[PDB]
Write a protein that binds this ligand. Structure first.
Ligand SMILES: CO[C@@H](C(=O)NC1Cc2ccccc2C1)[C@H](O)[C@@H](O)[C@H](O)/C=C/C(C)(C)C
Ligand SMILES: [Mn+2]
Ligand SMILES: [Mn+2]
Length: 282
């Protein structure tokens, strides 16, 4: 189709009052960035719940991706899943973000705002859902095809899923955190793709972005070694075209400047005593 432009947002969706809000709702910023990177066993138990719920909501929204649906509808479906399972949608009110997930079509790198945009045949759409429950967060995203997607776009989506999975498989106690982005970027560059730098994965736990940064490109200056009980996301955004990007007037939606398409996948991971566990499985 043509380059995307913003549509119209629906009103704020209410959350039942008994579901606890993260502290950052309504505030300019969150109290995050200095929390421990290794979680207690009690928080890891709570994060398995949050991760399962976020994974259910992402799958339920994903089922609705089809030509003719709006991105606003994918948000209604994710929102209703979260609140029916007693979770707060962590994006809603983080730095004023106005919706309960991010929906990023085609050339949107990330942080697309669900709205009246209608998906058509051949689009790809990333849906990114985070659940807050039990005082902890779980964060996952995936790119879904709508209709008959062109080969070059189907391959970019399947290879971005593959790069994410190959990076997950490196996680274990003692591994250098920098191996994640060496594996992702070495694999993506086999095909001529370019791995986004300015947006990264992150530690997550009782806070959304806890100060730990997970890079998806090769950066051996990072000295961090993975520890049992560390929790973080791997969420590479991979571009067909160049890395240059622009931000829309809403101050959220990030688009490639050349309008070439881009895909992303994300899980929340636990470093176990021997390897890795995906917490955002249902
Ligand atoms: C691509 O997006 C990731 C992202 O911006 N990382 C940054 C890594 C990092 C490191 C330190 C501090 C903040 C951050 C955010 C983000 O974590 C998404 O996965 C999340 O679902 C969306 C969150 C909103 C839209 C509410 C922001
Ligand atoms: Mn996410
Ligand atoms: Mn994330």
């Amino acid at each position: 189709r043509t380059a995307l432009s913003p549509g119209v947002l629906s009103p704020t969706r209410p959350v039942p009052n008994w579901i606890a809000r993260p502290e950052y709702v309504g505030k300019p910023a969150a109290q995050e960035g200095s929390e421990p990177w290794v979680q207690t066993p009690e928080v890891i138990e709570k994060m398995r719940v949050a991760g399962r719920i976020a994974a259910g909501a992402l799958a339920e929204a994903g089922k609705a991706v089809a030509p003719g649906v709006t991105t606003d509808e994918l948000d209604r479906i994710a929102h209703e899943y979260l609140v029916d399972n007693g979770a707060y949608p962590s994006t809603l009110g983080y730095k004023g973000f106005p919706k309960s997930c991010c929906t990023s079509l085609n050339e949107v790198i990330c942080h697309g705002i669900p709205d009246s945009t209608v998906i058509t045949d051949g689009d790809i759409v990333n849906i990114d859902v985070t659940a807050y429950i039990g005082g902890v967060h779980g964060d996952t995203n995936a790119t879904f095809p709508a209709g008959d997607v062109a080969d070059e776009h189907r391959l970019l989506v399947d290879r971005t899923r593959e790069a994410t999975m190959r990076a997950i498989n490196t996680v274990k106690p003692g591994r250098a955190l920098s191996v994640i982005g060496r594996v992702i970027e070495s694999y993506a560059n086999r095909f001529g793709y370019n791995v986004v730098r300015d947006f990264t994965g992150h530690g997550i736990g009782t806070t959304f972005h806890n100060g730990l940064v997970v890079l998806h490109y090769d950066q051996p200056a990072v000295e961090t070694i993975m520890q049992p009980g560390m929790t973080f996301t791997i969420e590479p955004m991979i571009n067909l075209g160049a890395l240059d990007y622009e931000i829309w007037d809403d101050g959220w939606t990030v688009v490639t400047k050349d309008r070439k398409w881009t895909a992303q996948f994300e899980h929340t991971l636990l470093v176990t005593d021997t390897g890795v566990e995906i917490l955002t499985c249902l």
